[PDB]
Design an enzyme around this catalytic site. Structure first.
Site, PDB file in Angstrom:
ATOM      1  N   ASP A   1       1.304  -1.145   0.322  1.00  0.00           N
ATOM      2  CA  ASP A   1       0.052  -0.244   0.322  1.00  0.00           C
ATOM      3  C   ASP A   1       1.073   1.636   0.067  1.00  0.00           C
ATOM      4  OD1 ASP A   1      -2.250   1.689   0.348  1.00  0.00           O
ATOM      5  OD2 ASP A   1      -2.527   1.332   2.316  1.00  0.00           O
TER       6      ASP A   1
ATOM      7  N   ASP B   1      -9.022   3.681  -1.166  1.00  0.00           N
ATOM      8  CA  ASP B   1     -10.199   4.319  -0.610  1.00  0.00           C
ATOM      9  C   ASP B   1     -11.601   4.774  -0.673  1.00  0.00           C
ATOM     10  OD1 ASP B   1      -8.091   3.523   1.328  1.00  0.00           O
ATOM     11  OD2 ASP B   1      -7.152   4.818   1.652  1.00  0.00           O
TER      12      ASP B   1
HETATM   13  N1  LIG Z   1      -1.506  14.266   4.954  1.00  0.00           N
HETATM   14  N2  LIG Z   1      -1.826  14.317   6.540  1.00  0.00           N
HETATM   15  N3  LIG Z   1      -1.812  12.877   7.168  1.00  0.00           N
HETATM   16  C1  LIG Z   1      -2.451  12.226   7.088  1.00  0.00           C
HETATM   17  C2  LIG Z   1      -2.924  11.160   6.044  1.00  0.00           C
HETATM   18  C3  LIG Z   1      -4.169  10.439   6.045  1.00  0.00           C
HETATM   19  C4  LIG Z   1      -4.917  10.209   7.520  1.00  0.00           C
HETATM   20  N4  LIG Z   1      -6.012   9.433   6.852  1.00  0.00           N
HETATM   21  C5  LIG Z   1      -6.514   8.999   4.941  1.00  0.00           C
HETATM   22  C6  LIG Z   1      -6.892   7.637   5.272  1.00  0.00           C
HETATM   23  C7  LIG Z   1      -6.308   6.487   3.934  1.00  0.00           C
HETATM   24  C8  LIG Z   1      -5.307   5.643   4.166  1.00  0.00           C
HETATM   25  N5  LIG Z   1      -5.725   4.439   3.181  1.00  0.00           N
HETATM   26  C9  LIG Z   1      -4.321   3.558   3.096  1.00  0.00           C
HETATM   27  C10 LIG Z   1      -3.528   2.843   4.921  1.00  0.00           C
HETATM   28  C11 LIG Z   1      -4.819   2.041   5.474  1.00  0.00           C
HETATM   29  O1  LIG Z   1      -5.656   2.908   5.806  1.00  0.00           O
HETATM   30  C12 LIG Z   1      -3.872   1.404   6.416  1.00  0.00           C
HETATM   31  O2  LIG Z   1      -2.426   1.240   6.064  1.00  0.00           O
HETATM   32  C13 LIG Z   1      -5.271   1.166   4.444  1.00  0.00           C
HETATM   33  O3  LIG Z   1      -6.339   0.665   5.431  1.00  0.00           O
HETATM   34  C14 LIG Z   1      -6.137   1.517   3.395  1.00  0.00           C
HETATM   35  O4  LIG Z   1      -6.622   0.115   2.621  1.00  0.00           O
HETATM   36  C15 LIG Z   1      -5.283   2.055   2.528  1.00  0.00           C
HETATM   37  O5  LIG Z   1      -5.440   2.418   1.425  1.00  0.00           O
HETATM   38  C16 LIG Z   1      -4.452  10.435   8.237  1.00  0.00           C
HETATM   39  N6  LIG Z   1      -5.289  10.349   9.560  1.00  0.00           N
HETATM   40  O6  LIG Z   1      -5.665   9.284   9.663  1.00  0.00           O
HETATM   41  O7  LIG Z   1      -5.042  12.112  10.033  1.00  0.00           O
HETATM   42  C17 LIG Z   1      -3.335  11.514   8.159  1.00  0.00           C
END
Ligand SMILES: [N-]=[N+]=Nc1ccc(NCCCCN[C@H]2C[C@](O)(CO)[C@@H](O)[C@H](O)[C@H]2O)c([N+](=O)[O-])c1
Ligand SMILES: [Ca+2]
Ligand SMILES: [Ca+2]
EC number: 3.2.1.207
Lengths: 87, 854
Positions: B452, B528
């Site tokens: 990923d 996502d």
């Molecule tokens: N820029 N700034 N920093 C950030 C950037 C993003 C962010 N959340 C985004 C959620 C998307 C994650 N999706 C990938 C990762 C997994 O979630 C875990 O490996 C997996 O499960 C999924 O399948 C993958 O596609 C946060 N935050 O949690 O505040 C802070």
């Protein structure tokens, strides 16, 4: 000379010869003709399991390669040898 | 999504320069005095009339009706990037001949015809013909643009707070293509957009730049996680394909205009390198593209089953509770997934010492249920002097570097992180060796991998990715290589799973970022998505656009990644995913638990029904994937691939086909009472596989539905193999007998295939240990023969049942197989549905046999 009798499904849906009992093909709609194989979707397999509680399992778990009965009798032709664990 | 973080074409200075060149008279002209017809290619100099810059066109005819066009500078100051490792071979060439010549024109014939290429000198132009039919024109609108390398936002450029030093200045290349007769184009994933691509004239071009877009939205051309620069054009009369072999940021304009579609590609660096794939049928295009970038890797059987995932399962006890929950609720499942919280503070190849203290034993308990596990391994490495992976990569200089020679450091899940240079073969070999059972301590043969964030995602980077002026192996800039970075990760991981086994086990790797050629290394998914009805709908056009460009092992997160789906949406998403290639439920960290037994019984039952249908169709799925692997044909298909002359199918995207045998129209609306199913084909029949009701095509049938309905139809003339004994996982099923479902054509015929092997090794290829059977029905006889005699396999699989739809009641059924006396079979027949069931043929699937209905 006299001969033998046929088998009747427990739901009453059919009568079949006894050579179609446990012949690895589902002939009764309630699964009652295959208590010893994985052929019927709605069947059950009886674990005797001496030394512990006896248990019924789904027919789909007979010779699936997974040990389901503690006595190991559900795996008799699958390549998985199960040990007795009824202790 | 916050769109201000991501550049529009106007904010991309090279896109702005290129897109400001509008259709008109091109300043480029070919110096026919320089023309040379070489041993495998034709070379001729081009010149810009104003700048007097000299380019070189390398024009090639190729075997399998393809043409390749390459344009580079004649005397560059430094070499331009040419994309390595994507082409599986040097494409075999076909000889060019001059068959015509005047003051302004040279006609070239490929081999002995019928394909011809007209090179016009002034203005520079290429036309491609089959005899006298014009197929395609190059530079017909004068949009060719080749920024030559000048003396080291056109140079230094800033976006938000990030400054691209841009040490080489403007280097972008662009070129246009005219498709006369075409009104429908498809491809260039990945975009959350419709299957049929829209014109870009009044808006943004389609963008190809692997990027991590948070909570991405629907129906827009923003670049998502992967980029496949392949465009397909379909009309009633012909099919064509364009393969723009460039790894830099690329924008694609599409315009309509007697009906004609024009296509313009715009890339930041590298050379012009494009393949024209002339068809004429869409399956010819599939074959042509497959010969260039390869075919879909044969998935191990288990990976075509059901995957249970979320962010995150808590600990070993949780994983085992989930495992036992599937068995306690009689639901099949092959793989349970471990997201980033299973490692030690997002240090990959490690295990949290409290929550995952004994991974071998966890893996052993899963092996005893004959199930697998997937662990996530991302390509960003925590900057941490106690992290052995980081120390070894730092000590061996295998990290991506900045211009000053220090290792690049960005921010990701573990905080400050460095990025291995996967364009470096020495890095990829290191990575592959890290998956050995001695190096990846705690791993075992039933552990597989998820790559990923491999765009690469960089949280504090420009557009959430790496600086354009970071430096890779051999001095190339990151702007040169960006779109193949993920592919290299996917490739190094997949090779590691092969090597750790001694070259025997087939890999399984899911990857988020991808490029042309990614189909050779495993699966991808659409990232996502969100728990909403419209995201459920869009999974079809997204995976269809990936199927058309060779990526058949595609899917979307079942239930949606973000937010909580209502039970009815979750049920409909299970039914949808149950008929898509990659079938995994996944969920965000803050979502409620949604393992499928946590719902009320009515929803549980419909989900279980969808899971059973998937497991029963594994022999069919497996065969479709073997055909994808051998021939390059997509598994999931748009209706227009099977009905190229039915113009009402050219845009359909709420319906799809699996191979040529099954048409699927899943319910994708809350509270729906029916669906409108277009059944295509003249003189074609279709069978409702739930009621066995036969329907003649072409029509739009209104079909009432309940919560448990999955509208699926089998095409007349096809034979679909099923395992009707659903067990807890596919490993438990792979020696079980087959039931054959024969759907009779109106002429009383049907045909089908079946592939079988051990389910997980390369023995089918290295020892020819497999079975490829052909089943065919005509007259009143069903016959099994070998579709490939080189394949032999020791297997207990037999034929326990034959279900024939559209048949009358016979008087007797007789089976003949070599080596056995002639046998009579008993049967059951329903006069209402015209369904005939043959009881227990009992013949081995490796044997030739025939069944006659008297
Ligand atoms: N820029 N700034 N920093 C950030 C950037 C993003 C962010 N959340 C985004 C959620 C998307 C994650 N999706 C990938 C990762 C997994 O979630 C875990 O490996 C997996 O499960 C999924 O399948 C993958 O596609 C946060 N935050 O949690 O505040 C802070
Ligand atoms: Ca029986
Ligand atoms: Ca068992």
């Amino acid at each position: 000379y006299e001969e033998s009798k046929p088998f009747t499904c427990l739901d009453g849906t059919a009568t079949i010869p006894f050579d179609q009992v446990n012949d690895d093909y589902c002939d009764c709609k309630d699964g009652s003709d295959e208590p010893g194989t994985a052929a019927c979707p709605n069947g059950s397999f009886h674990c005797t399991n001496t030394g512990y509680k006896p248990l019924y399992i789904l027919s789909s778990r007979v010779n699936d390669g997974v040990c389901d009965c503690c006595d190991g009798t559900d795996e008799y032709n699958s390549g998985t040898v199960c040990e007795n664990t009824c202790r | 999504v916050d769109r201000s973080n991501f550049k529009t074409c106007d904010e991309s200075s090279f896109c702005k320069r290129q897109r400001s060149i509008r259709p008109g008279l091109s300043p480029y002209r070919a110096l026919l005095d320089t023309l040379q017809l070489g041993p495998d290619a034709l070379t001729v100099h081009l010149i810009h009339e104003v700048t007097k810059v000299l380019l070189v066109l390398e024009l090639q005819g190729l075997q399998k009706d393809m043409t390749r066009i390459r344009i580079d500078e004649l005397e560059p100051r430094r070499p331009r990037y040419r994309v390595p490792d994507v082409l599986v071979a040097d494409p075999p060439t076909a000889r060019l001949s001059v068959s015509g010549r005047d003051d302004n024109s040279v006609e070239l014939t490929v081999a002995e015809g019928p394909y011809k290429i007209i090179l016009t000198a002034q203005p520079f132009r290429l036309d491609l013909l089959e005899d006298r039919s014009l197929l395609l024109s190059v530079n017909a609108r004068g949009l060719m643009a080749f920024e030559h390398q000048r003396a080291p936002g056109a140079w230094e450029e800033t976006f938000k707070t990030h400054s691209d030093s841009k040490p080489y200045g403007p280097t972008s290349v662009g070129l246009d293509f005219s498709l006369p007769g075409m009104e429908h184009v498809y491809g260039i994933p990945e975009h959350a957009d419709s299957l049929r691509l829209k014109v870009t004239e009044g808006g943004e071009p389609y963008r190809l730049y692997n990027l991590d877009v948070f909570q991405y939205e629907l129906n827009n051309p923003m670049a998502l996680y992967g980029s496949v620069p392949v465009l397909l054009a379909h009309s009633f009369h012909r099919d064509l394909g364009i393969f723009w072999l460039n790894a830099a940021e690329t924008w694609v304009d599409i315009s309509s205009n007697t009906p004609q579609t024009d296509i313009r590609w715009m890339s930041e660096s590298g050379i012009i390198d494009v393949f024209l794939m002339l068809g004429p049928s869409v399956f010819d295009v599939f074959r042509q593209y497959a010969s260039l970038t390869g075919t879909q890797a044969l998935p191990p059987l288990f990976s075509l089953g059901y995957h249970q995932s979320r962010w995150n399962y808590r600990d070993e006890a949780d994983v085992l509770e989930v495992d036992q929950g599937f068995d306690d609720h009689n639901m099949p499942c092959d793989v349970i997934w471990l997201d980033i919280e299973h490692a030690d503070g997002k240090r990959y190849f490690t295990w949290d010492p409290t929550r995952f203290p004994q991974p071998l034993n966890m893996l052993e308990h899963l092996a005893s249920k004959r199930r697998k596990l997937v662990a996530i391994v991302d390509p960003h490495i925590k900057v941490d002097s106690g992290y052995r992976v980081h120390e070894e990569l730092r000590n061996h200089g295998l990290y991506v570097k900045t211009r000053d020679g220090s290792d690049y450091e960005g921010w990701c899940w573990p905080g400050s992180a460095s990025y291995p240079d996967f364009t470096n073969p020495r890095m990829r070999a290191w990575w592959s060796n890290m998956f050995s059972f001695d190096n990846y301590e705690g791993s075992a043969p039933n552990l597989y991998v998820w790559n990923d964030m491999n765009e690469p995602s960089v949280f504090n980077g420009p557009e959430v990715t790496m600086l354009k002026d970071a430096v890779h192996y051999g001095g190339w800039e990151h702007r040169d290589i960006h779109n193949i970075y993920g592919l290299y990760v996917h490739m190094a991981t997949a090779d590691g799973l092969i090597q750790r086994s001694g070259g025997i086990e087939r890999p399984f790797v899911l990857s988020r970022a991808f490029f042309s050629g990614s189909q050779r290394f495993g699966a991808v998914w659409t990232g996502d998505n969100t728990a909403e009805w419209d995201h459920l709908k869009i999974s079809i056009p997204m995976c269809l656009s990936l199927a058309l460009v060779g990526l058949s092992f595609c899917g979307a997160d079942v239930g949606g990644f973000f937010k909580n789906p209502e039970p009815e949406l979750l049920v409909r998403w299970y039914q949808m995913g149950a008929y898509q290639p990659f079938f995994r439920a996944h969920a965000h960290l803050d979502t409620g638990r949604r393992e499928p037994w946590l719902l009320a019984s009515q929803y549980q039952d419909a989900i279980r029904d969808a899971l059973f249908q998937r497991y029963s169709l594994l022999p069919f799925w497996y065969t479709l994937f073997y055909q994808a692997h051998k021939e390059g044909f997509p598994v999931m298909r748009p209706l227009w691939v099977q009905y190229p002359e039915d113009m009402s199918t050219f845009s359909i995207e709420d319906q799809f086909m699996l191979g040529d045998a099954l048409l699927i129209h899943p319910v994708s609306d809350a509270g729906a009472h029916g669906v409108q199913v277009y059944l295509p084909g003249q003189e074609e029949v279709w069978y409702d596989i739930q009621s066995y009701q036969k329907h003649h095509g072409p029509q739009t049938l209104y079909l009432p539905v309940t919560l448990s309905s999955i509208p699926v139809f089998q095409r007349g003339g096809t034979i679909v193999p099923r395992w009707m004994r659903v067990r807890r996982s596919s490993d438990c099923m792979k020696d079980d007998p087959i039931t054959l479902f024969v759907a009779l054509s109106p002429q009383g015929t049907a045909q089908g295939e079946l592939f079988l092997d051990d389910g997980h090794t390369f023995n089918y290829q290295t020892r020819h240990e497999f079975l490829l059977r052909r089943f065919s029905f005509s007259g009143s006889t069903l016959v099994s023969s070998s579709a490939d005699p080189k394949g032999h396999l020791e297997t207990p699989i037999w034929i326990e049942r034959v279900v024939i739809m559209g048949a009358g009641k016979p008087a007797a059924v007789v089976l003949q197989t070599k080596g056995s006396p002639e046998s009579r079979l008993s049967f059951q027949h329903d006069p209402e549905t015209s369904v005939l069931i043959l009881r227990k043929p009992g013949v081995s699937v490796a044997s030739d046999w025939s069944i006659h209905l008297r």
